[PDB]
Ligand binder design. Structure first.
Ligand SMILES: [Cl-]
Ligand SMILES: [Cl-]
Ligand SMILES: [Mg+2]
Ligand SMILES: [Mg+2]
Ligand SMILES: [Mg+2]
Ligand SMILES: [Mg+2]
Lengths: 243, 231, 196, 204, 244, 5, 221, 250, 241, 195
């Protein structure tokens, strides 16, 4: 054997074991979700409070690309930051040449092709992150989830990390119960609940909630962080549902 | 075992062993403590010597008038990363006439360490850094790990027996955070914190290394007879 | 050269003469200065024929590759690609291009790109050597939300005067109509437009 | 400071009945100053003859370059290069230096060993081929040579008659040019013998 | 990374030998024997073609003996493809020298430069060495008639008579036995063929399985002529010496 | 050089 | 003087055979008609070396392209490759070409300028005698020309150049490219400038020229 | 990133074997039988068109390729490796000869250029050898008709007649009995079809057999008239009909 | 055994990495089919959306390379999109350089040559995909050309790819034995799509809803994919006969 | 730099080179040796642009001396002259060409013949019985055309050379402060101290 020792090597199955090993690093990471809504998207993430010494609200994990795209990821934090840094260069060069801000499907492929490129050679390591991202463009709202292999699809709801199966189960219920659609302000409250429900799979350390959102009506099509009254309103909603 | 030959290889459980071995180099390193209030941020570093005839390895490096770090692990790697921070702090000043944010300083170190963990031939940095600074959003303390993970904290400690000082600061959190407009008392709290990581050895005049930055205080380092006050 | 693009109710109309000259000799008297960069994005070429042909070919290539990945580009996007080439290579280019396209959302749009490589979005644009003689006429006669027949008459009368006074302009008046209906080519011969 | 007319010199090539003639002057000067009266401008690679006029340093360089290329040709092909093929090689080599050219006026002459057909060709400094049935002229007295050749020349001349025509064409042309003359050389080329004659001409 | 699959072609053994050079020589030892014999009035190059097929075109064939210039030739032993790379380089190097100095290249200078290229592949680049051994037969106005041999190591030495390829041990003993210094070309021709005839792995030595060449001053007055023997010319010289 | 219809 | 004329079932290009260095006629009967491909022919004016070099290079790349794609080459491919090459060199390659031919798409006629600008037309003329030629084309050209009419118009347009333009002279070369047929290259189609018999033979009595030395040259090995 | 394979993947084994060349020759052995026969007035190259599927159009896949108007090529072994060699072989004929001498290279020199490309794949960094053996038939004015074999090593040999691939051992023995120095081109085509029938198992007709000749000049295939010296290509690919005509009188 | 890790020859003259790239082809468990009409070329592929959270509009293995050329992929989506983007760039560049739309067979050869390089060069792995190119070429007419990880490519009368490729292949073979022609003798592309779906149903033995199928159609001067409602309309016509 | 002469006679080559080095309105030196020994039986005199002359001469000297060590053999005057010409032929199409004119006087030990080569800065080589560079030629060539014979001795050559220097000293505008004379023969290179 030894097929798993080198990246870009096909096993007799036709599998790249190094990419499957990168997925194990993602599964080990904290829970992050994405909820597609009526006229935008909502991103939420679990931040494990390792110690009292961590400054609250001052270890931001969700990252903005351009002014209209939000990105959250689970697994190796640095890898995620590297991918967003690339995303920003791709989005900048698109706007530079074509004037218009990069569409989400266009942006999704730019990351997809970049992550896929890191499965072609043994001289590079696959990305140790599953990235949930999206925003609002001319064609409306888009939510995507990108995996170490370079595989991405459009999603109604997306979840990754240690509590992905708990989150996925809760996301599936929203899609079933809201066929006509979910509102931006509702999706923020739901996002909070699902993180709190997904925290049951990581319940040794207590955690800190972080939510962001793009909405054509609520945020004027731009990416903003949910803070202050709207954040505490979402936390209180989540606290009431677990009890 | 078979997956620790280079940094480009993942283990079957999704671990980077070369990055973990680089993390191990920090644990062997001499203890250093970081803690801050709202007005000032303090670095305390236990310096290490080869023998009684040798000097004590300098742990603290100045990056700008408003920023600097303490090191634990490979000192040459700290020199490379500190030199990079100096250039980034300097680039911000010359181009934008702007003091580099301590948060951006962290983001830049994170991205520099990361590139060394994803490419063949290179190796991870073998040092951990505690960056303190005072910018437009007050006092800051960062913990840099060569995995790429940078964390903003009230207080922390890295190196051998750092768990002793880290437990003390976790107890003292509510006290030392409110030491505002009092440099000497914030240092005393830092010196008492690092004292919880000592075994057989005690803090002497050429052993202890303290650095402070704050509201009306440029980043300055205290060594020799200047730290005799705090023993 | 005499060229112009006019926006009206149903979309936009592109107009140009058909005269390419070397000094005071007419190299081509039946030139097509209206060129397709996309199905419903066309451009008007003035300056060095060689330079404008080179730019147009590259833009067409860029918008074809854009369409393959991200679907139909906007008229603004096309004008941005033109600008990028004209601005970044301003030292080595002599190209005055009017970009005119029909979206379903944005309707008829006209962007003019002078020598510098600056972009100007306008309700109508005139360019080329013969444009100087019809600034007075076009300003006085242009109205927004004209009909197809009114816009064709406006362009025909305008380029008729431009051709009459400018030695560098003449031949036939070519026109390209961009609307939701599709793409229509029009031609007008000296015997008609000269005696307007 | 005109590279083509610093050193001076002329080459002329003619065709006859189953033969070719190539001739050149022997002058190498530095403008007004005559320096050498032994500077031959005709070289040969097997049975193919090349005459080069223009800047003397480039005449020497190109001779050495074509000797280089014809030697490698023969080793790989296992046969001598033919005039038609060599003409293409010269053209290729000159145009390779399109925007930094050799200031030369080369002239190929020879008989194709297979077909036995007489062949002559001329080039500009950037390698444009000028093929001719009758004659090729080159150098600082090209105008003079054109006038002499166009009047004197007639087709299907015997080697002995052809010698007299090409010789009188060169001599009288060289005497009306300040930068040409100082002795001349004539090559009479038959299928499988080549005669080389040095002409007596006025030494001014 | 790629380190895993690197053979490390340019390293020393514990004994201080170059693995790849030693294995390249082992390769050459299976190649058809090539003999060079230097006489007072010329040089002989004889080479045995590798197990010939009856349907091989023999007259328009070149496997062993190659022409570098008008004065120098080489007999090949090893990979023919590798030899042709080095021959084209040697041919260019000879013309570069002629172009520079307006004089035909001295034999040793050509041999040294070709040997220096082989040396390069054993010390740096991480590529396999050229699996080729040459016998250089040439003339210049300094040393006159010269035989050299180069091998994959890039080491070259001068000889009076030498063999490369298969059965060199047996071949070198037979040459050492019958060779003398006052020898003529016609005698050296006979020795070359007689040596191959005894050392050959074939049943009987025939015209179709041989390449033959001489470098004489047999041309008209103080000039060297290279003769690459035709099939019929080898058939005649083989009868004339009484081998067939 | 230079020849130039 | 070079021109191209379109007729019903194909295109015809013609050119004169005068090559000049300054005011001197270097070649009285040179070939300005180049074969890019078997059914794509090119006529070139400007720097002689540049027209020959650029037509051969694209002709080479067209042949490799034809073999690669398993298809007969197109005139637009030759046109695109020529104009992009000429444009890259900013007019320093002084090649003024009339590109014509037949391909699976149909019959085509284009002109290319040194700076890389291309034009489309039913009749075109390039070179020093283009104005003399274009005058004839403008006077006698009509829509729906036959093969024989187009050859007559094309050759008449070249003749106008030959007589009236000092840059042009000697003979008329023609190449007819008809759809569904092999392109026929008519080298020296007209020869209306034959040199009249000389008044006198200038054959010298043998021994007229004074000789200093004789020697046999060795061409053999 | 970047190609870190700057070292040879083909190296000498202790026994003196170049493993990758030996294994490349094994791949050629597995390949479908192709052959070449040289006549007095022409050359014939032939091979079986092994169809991957009956739905596949075997006309689109050309095993016999034109390199120059007077040179043709057929192979045994890995088809893809052959296809890119034909592309490189056609280009090198132009770049390294025709653009210098204004005429097509002679057979032996084009073979030499192809051999050089295949030799470099044996020694260059981070590449395997080509898994094909070529048979190159060609004509030129000074050498006349010639037939060459090119092996993965970069070694080439001139042949009167030979076969490569699956049933080469039996095919070569068959050609030894039938070949003489007085064979006319039509006699060589007849022997080629007889030799190929032995190796072919399934259908034997003009649709399953690919056969081309290097013979007389073809003015009809030139595509233009007016230049006397240009008389047309000597390379001609026999049609499916032309083969079936010769299979009746077999 | 490092001869099984990179693209070098095994003792028996095989490239195991190329052979393992072929097994990656069937990792998606999707069967594709391509057939030619008189005026058109139709390609159909199974559409499997297992996750309920997925946006089904974004789940596609059919790509619009150029205006005239369409491409369906059998293999993982990352390698599929890698191949798609390259083909689009190659088709765009071809048009710019040579002044006419890249033919289907020429693009197929170009992508096959790129695939061949990966089988010879060590640092590049083969793409675990089989690319089926379809168009109505202006010279050759309706065209199907398929590429594989080996760098092999050939024209097809019709073709099928995927796990149950052999069942579909013989189903099509038996039809062309009967019809005695190289194509589907049909005027409209609508009925050629109906043929394609019908023969896939017979071969696989499964029924299809509108969301179970994905259809691409190549006509003269444009290739386009069908919406769910375009396929639903097509499924109704089959059921009513 | 200005006057360099060369005369090939029966059994030797004689090189005469002016001693004056002038910059502006000042003769900085009146004892300058404008020559380098390339090998025991090859001498090269040089004249032209300041700095370029010595830099070029020493560069050639180093290359010929390197060859002599490598092969343990002296290159023929013909071989050296061909090498020098190629270096100047390269130079003239460089970014900044060597503006240096050289005479190469050598004795070929294999042929037992003296050889004089005149090479200008363009890389224009000629073998001559007598040669000169710069304005010197305009006087000396016509003088030597008259007085020179091919079978002359070294002593006759020196008297012929004195006749040239006298003519130059009479009619040349600039004071070149006399010449250093050197003889190249079978016994190598030696300098005439009293001229
Ligand atoms: Cl135009
Ligand atoms: Cl390709
Ligand atoms: Mg006018
Ligand atoms: Mg005179
Ligand atoms: Mg005079
Ligand atoms: Mg590979």
């Amino acid at each position: 054997t030894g097929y798993d020792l080198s990246n870009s090597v096909f096993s007799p199955d036709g599998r790249n074991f190094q990419v499957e090993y990168a997925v194990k690093a993602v599964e080990n990471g904290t829970t992050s979700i994405g909820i597609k809504c009526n006229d935008g998207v909502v991103f939420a993430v679990e931040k494990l409070i390792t110690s009292k010494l961590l400054v609250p609200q001052k270890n931001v994990k969700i990252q903005v690309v351009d002014r209209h795209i939000g990105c959250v990821y689970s697994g190796l934090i640095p890898d995620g930051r590297h991918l967003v840094n690339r995303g920003r260069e791709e989005a900048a060069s698109f706007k530079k040449l074509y004037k218009t801000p990069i569409p989400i499907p266009a942006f999704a492929d730019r990351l997809g092709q970049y992550v896929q490129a890191h499965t072609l050679y043994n001289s590079v390591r696959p990305f140790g992150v599953s990235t949930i991202f999206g925003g609002v463009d001319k064609n409306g709202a888009h939510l995507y989830m990108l995996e170490p292999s370079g595989s991405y699809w459009g999603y109604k709801g997306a979840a990754t990390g240690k509590g992905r199966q708990s989150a996925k189960a809760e996301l599936e219920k929203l899609v079933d119960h809201h066929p006509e659609g979910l509102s931006a302000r509702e999706a923020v409250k739901q996002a909070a609940k699902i993180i709190y429900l997904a925290h049951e799979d990581n319940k040794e350390k207590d955690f800190e909630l972080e939510i962001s959102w793009c909405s054509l009506s609520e945020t004027n099509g731009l990416h903003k962080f949910v803070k202050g009254d709207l954040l505490q309103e979402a936390i209180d909603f989540a606290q009431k549902e677990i009890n | 075992n078979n997956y620790d030959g280079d940094t480009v290889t993942f283990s079957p459980t999704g671990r980077l062993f070369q990055v973990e071995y680089a993390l191990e180099a920090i644990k062997q390193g001499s203890v250093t403590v970081g803690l801050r209030s709202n007005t000032h941020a303090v670095l305390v570093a236990l310096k290490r010597n080869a023998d009684e005839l040798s000097s004590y390895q300098k742990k603290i490096i100045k990056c700008d008038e408003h920023m600097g770090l303490s090191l634990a692990g490979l000192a040459p790697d700290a020199r490379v990363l500190s030199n990079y921070l100096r250039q980034q702090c300097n680039y911000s000043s010359l181009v934008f006439n702007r003091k580099l944010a301590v948060e951006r300083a962290g983001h830049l170190l994170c991205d520099k360490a990361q590139k060394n963990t994803q490419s063949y031939g290179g190796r991870p940095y073998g040092v951990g850094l505690l960056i303190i600074g005072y910018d437009k959003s007050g006092a800051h303390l960062l913990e840099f790990q060569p995995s790429g993970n940078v964390t903003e904290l009230y207080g922390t400690a890295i190196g051998a027996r750092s768990q002793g000082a880290k437990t003390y600061l976790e107890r003292t959190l509510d006290t030392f955070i409110k030491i505002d407009g009092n440099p000497d008392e914030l240092i005393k709290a830092g010196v008492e914190a690092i004292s919880q990581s000592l075994r057989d050895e005690s803090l002497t005049v050429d052993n202890l290394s303290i650095a402070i930055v704050g509201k009306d205080t440029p980043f300055t380092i205290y060594d020799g007879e200047a730290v005799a006050k705090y023993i | 050269t005499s060229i112009m693009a006019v926006t009206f109710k149903d979309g936009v109309i592109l107009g140009a003469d058909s005269r390419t000259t070397t000094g005071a000799y007419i190299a081509n008297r039946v030139t097509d200065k209206l060129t397709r960069v996309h199905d419903k994005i066309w451009c008007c070429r003035s300056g060095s024929a060689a330079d404008t042909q080179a730019i147009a070919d590259i833009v067409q290539y860029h918008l074809e590759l854009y369409t393959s990945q991200y679907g139909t580009p906007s008229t603004e996007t096309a004008a941005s690609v033109f600008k990028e080439l004209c601005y970044e290579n301003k030292d080595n280019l002599t190209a005055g291009i009017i970009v005119a396209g029909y979206d379903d959302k944005n309707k008829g749009e006209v962007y003019t790109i002078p020598l510098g490589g600056s972009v100007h979005k306008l309700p109508y644009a005139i360019a080329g050597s013969g444009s100087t003689f019809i600034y007075g006429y076009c300003d006085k006669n242009f109205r927004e939300n004209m009909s197809k027949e009114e816009t064709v008459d406006f362009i025909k009368h305008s380029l008729s005067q431009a051709i009459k006074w400018d030695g560098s302009s003449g031949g036939v008046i070519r026109m390209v109509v961009l609307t939701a209906a599709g793409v229509e080519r029009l031609i007008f011969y000296p015997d008609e437009y000269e005696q307007l | 400071s005109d590279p083509s007319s610093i050193n001076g010199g002329i080459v002329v090539a003619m065709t006859g009945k189953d033969c070719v003639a190539i001739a050149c002057d022997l002058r190498l000067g530095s403008q007004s100053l005559g320096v050498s009266n032994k500077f031959e401008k005709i070289f040969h690679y097997g049975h193919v003859f090349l005459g080069i006029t223009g800047l003397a340093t480039d005449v020497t360089t190109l001779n050495e370059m074509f000797r280089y290329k014809t030697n490698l040709y023969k080793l790989k092909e296992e046969r001598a290069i033919e005039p038609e093929t060599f003409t293409q090689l010269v053209s290729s080599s000159l145009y390779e230096r399109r925007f930094g050219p050799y200031f030369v006026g080369p002239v190929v002459a020879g008989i194709n060993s297979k077909s036995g057909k007489p062949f002559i060709a001329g080039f500009d400094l950037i390698g444009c081929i000028d093929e001719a049935k009758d004659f090729i002229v080159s150098g600082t007295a090209s105008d003079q040579l054109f006038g002499m050749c166009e009047s004197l020349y007639e087709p299907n001349l015997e080697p002995e008659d052809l010698f007299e025509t090409i010789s009188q064409a060169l001599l009288n042309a060289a005497d009306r040019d300040a930068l040409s003359g100082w002795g001349a050389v004539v090559y009479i080329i038959k299928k499988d013998e080549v005669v080389k004659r040095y002409l007596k001409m006025r030494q001014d | 990374g790629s380190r895993r699959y690197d053979s490390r072609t340019t390293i020393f053994s514990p004994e201080g030998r170059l693995y790849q050079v030693e294995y390249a020589l082992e390769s050459i030892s299976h190649a058809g024997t090539a003999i060079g014999i230097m006489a007072s009035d010329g040089i002989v190059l004889a080479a045995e073609r590798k197990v010939t097929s009856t349907l091989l075109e023999q007259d328009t064939s070149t496997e062993k003996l190659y022409k570098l210039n008008d004065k120098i030739a080489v007999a090949v032993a090893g990979l023919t493809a590798d030899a042709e790379i080095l021959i084209n380089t040697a041919r260019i190097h000879a013309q570069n020298y002629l172009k520079t100095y307006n004089e035909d290249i001295p034999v040793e200078i050509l041999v040294r430069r070709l040997s220096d290229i082989k040396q390069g592949y054993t010390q740096h680049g991480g590529l396999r060495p050229f699996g080729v051994s040459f016998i250089y037969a040439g003339y210049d106005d300094r040393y006159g008639y010269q035989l050299y041999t180069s091998n994959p190591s890039g080491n070259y030495t001068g000889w009076k008579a030498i063999s490369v390829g298969a059965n060199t041990s047996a071949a070198q003993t037979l040459l050492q036995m019958d060779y003398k210094d006052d020898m003529k070309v016609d005698d050296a021709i006979e020795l070359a063929l007689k040596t191959l005839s005894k050392t050959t792995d074939s049943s009987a030595l025939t015209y179709d399985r041989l390449e033959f060449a001489t470098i004489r001053k047999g041309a008209n007055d103080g000039e060297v002529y290279q003769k690459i023997f035709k099939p019929q010319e080898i058939k005649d010289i083989l009868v004339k010496t009484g081998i067939t | 050089x230079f020849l130039x219809x | 003087t070079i021109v191209g004329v379109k007729f019903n079932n194909g295109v015809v290009i013609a050119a004169d055979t005068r090559s000049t260095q300054g005011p001197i006629v270097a070649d009285k009967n040179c070939a300005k008609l180049h074969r890019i491909s078997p059914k794509i022919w090119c006529a070139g004016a400007g720097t002689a070396a540049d027209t020959e070099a650029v037509t051969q290079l694209i002709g080479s790349n067209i042949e490799l392209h034809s073999l690669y794609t398993s298809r007969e080459p197109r005139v637009v491919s030759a046109l695109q490759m020529l104009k992009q090459h000429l444009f890259k060199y900013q007019g320093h390659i002084g090649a003024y070409l009339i590109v014509a031919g037949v391909d699976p798409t149909g019959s085509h006629l284009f002109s290319i300028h040194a700076h890389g600008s291309t034009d489309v037309g039913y009749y075109l003329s390039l070179g020093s005698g283009s104005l003399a030629a274009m005058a004839v084309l403008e006077s006698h050209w009509k829509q729906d020309l036959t093969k024989e009419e187009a050859i007559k118009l094309a050759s008449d347009a070249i003749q106008a150049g030959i007589w009236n333009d000092l840059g042009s002279g000697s003979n008329v070369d023609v190449c007819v490219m008809e759809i569904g047929k092999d392109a026929e290259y008519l080298r020296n189609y007209l020869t209306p400038n034959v040199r009249e018999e000389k008044q006198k033979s200038y054959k010298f009595p043998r021994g007229t020229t004074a000789v200093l030395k004789e020697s046999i040259v060795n061409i053999c090995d | 990133m970047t190609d870190r394979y700057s070292f040879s993947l083909t190296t000498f084994s202790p026994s003196g074997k170049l493993g990758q060349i030996d294994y490349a020759l094994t791949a050629v052995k597995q390949g479908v039988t192709s052959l070449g026969i040289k006549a007095t007035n022409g050359v014939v190259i032939a091979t079986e068109k092994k169809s991957s599927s009956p739905l596949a159009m075997s006309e689109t896949l050309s095993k016999v390729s034109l390199l120059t108007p007077d040179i043709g090529a057929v192979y045994s072994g890995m088809g893809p490796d052959y296809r890119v060699l034909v592309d490189k072989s056609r280009k090198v004929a132009h770049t390294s000869y025709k653009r210098i001498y204004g005429e097509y290279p002679p057979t032996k020199l084009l073979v030499s250029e192809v051999a050089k490309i295949m030799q470099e794949a044996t020694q260059s960094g981070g590449v395997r050898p080509f898994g094909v053996s070529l048979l190159i038939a060609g004509h030129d004015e000074f050498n006349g008709f010639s037939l060459y074999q090119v092996d993965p090593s970069g070694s080439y040999f001139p042949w009167k007649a030979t076969a490569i691939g699956k049933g080469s051992v039996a095919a070569k023995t068959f050609l030894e009995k039938r070949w003489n120095d007085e064979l006319e081109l039509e006699d060589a085509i007849h022997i080629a079809l007889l030799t190929l029938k032995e190796s072919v198992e399934g259908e034997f007709n003009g649709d399953t057999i690919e056969l081309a000749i290097i013979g007389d000049e073809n003015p009809d295939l030139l595509g233009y008239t007016g230049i006397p010296t240009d008389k047309g290509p000597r390379f001609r690919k026999l049609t499916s009909q032309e083969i079936n005509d010769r299979l009746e009188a077999l | 055994g490092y001869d099984r890790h990179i693209t070098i020859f095994s003792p028996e003259g095989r490239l195991y990495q190329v052979e393992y790239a072929f097994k990656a082809t069937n990792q998606t468990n999707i069967n594709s089919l391509a057939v030619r009409g008189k005026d058109c070329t139709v390609v159909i592929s199974q559409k499997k959306v297992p996750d309920k959270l997925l946006d089904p509009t974004t789940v596609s293995y059919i790509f619009c390379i150029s205006r005239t050329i369409g491409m369906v992929v059998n293999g993982p989506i990352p390698d599929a999109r890698n191949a798609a983007l390259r083909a689009k760039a190659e088709a765009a560049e071809f048009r710019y350089k040579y002044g006419y739309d890249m033919p289907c067979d020429v693009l197929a050869k170009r992508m096959a040559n790129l695939s061949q390089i990966y089988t010879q060069r060590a640092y590049m792995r083969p793409l675990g995909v089989i690319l089926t190119f379809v168009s109505v070429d202006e010279e050759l007419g309706p065209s199907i050309y398929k590429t594989d990880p080996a760098g092999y490519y050939v024209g097809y009368k019709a073709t099928a790819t995927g796990p149950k490729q052999q069942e579909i292949t013989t189903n099509l073979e038996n039809h062309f034995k009967k019809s005695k022609i190289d194509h589907i003798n049909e005027e409209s592309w609508e009925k050629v799509v109906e043929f394609a779906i019908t023969h896939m149903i017979d071969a696989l033995g499964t029924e299809f809803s509108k969301n179970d199928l994905e259809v691409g159609v190549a006509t003269k001067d444009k290739f386009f994919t069908l919406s769910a409602e375009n396929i639903e309309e097509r499924l109704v016509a089959i059921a009513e006969q | 730099m200005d006057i360099i002469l060369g005369i090939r006679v029966q059994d030797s080559v004689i090189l005469a080179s002016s001693k004056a080095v002038t910059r502006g309105i000042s003769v900085l030196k009146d004892s300058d040796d404008k020559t380098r020994q390339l090998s025991p039986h090859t001498l090269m005199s040089f004249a032209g642009e300041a700095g370029d002359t010595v830099q070029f001469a020493e560069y050639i000297q180093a290359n010929i001396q390197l060859y002599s060590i490598r092969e343990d053999y002296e290159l023929s005057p013909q071989a050296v002259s061909s090498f020098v010409r190629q270096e100047l032929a390269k130079s003239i199409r460089s970014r900044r060409p060597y503006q240096v004119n050289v005479l190469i006087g050598g004795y070929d030990k294999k042929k037992n013949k003296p050889e004089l080569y005149q090479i200008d800065y363009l890389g224009t080589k000629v073998e001559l019985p007598y040669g000169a560079h710069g304005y010197s030629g305009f006087y000396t060539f016509s003088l030597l055309d008259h007085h020179y014979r091919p079978d002359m001795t070294t002593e006759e050559g020196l008297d012929l050379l004195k006749l040239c220097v006298q003519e130059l000293e009479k009619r040349m505008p600039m004071d070149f402060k006399g010449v250093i004379v050197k003889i190249v023969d079978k016994d190598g290179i030696r300098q005439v101290d009293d001229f």
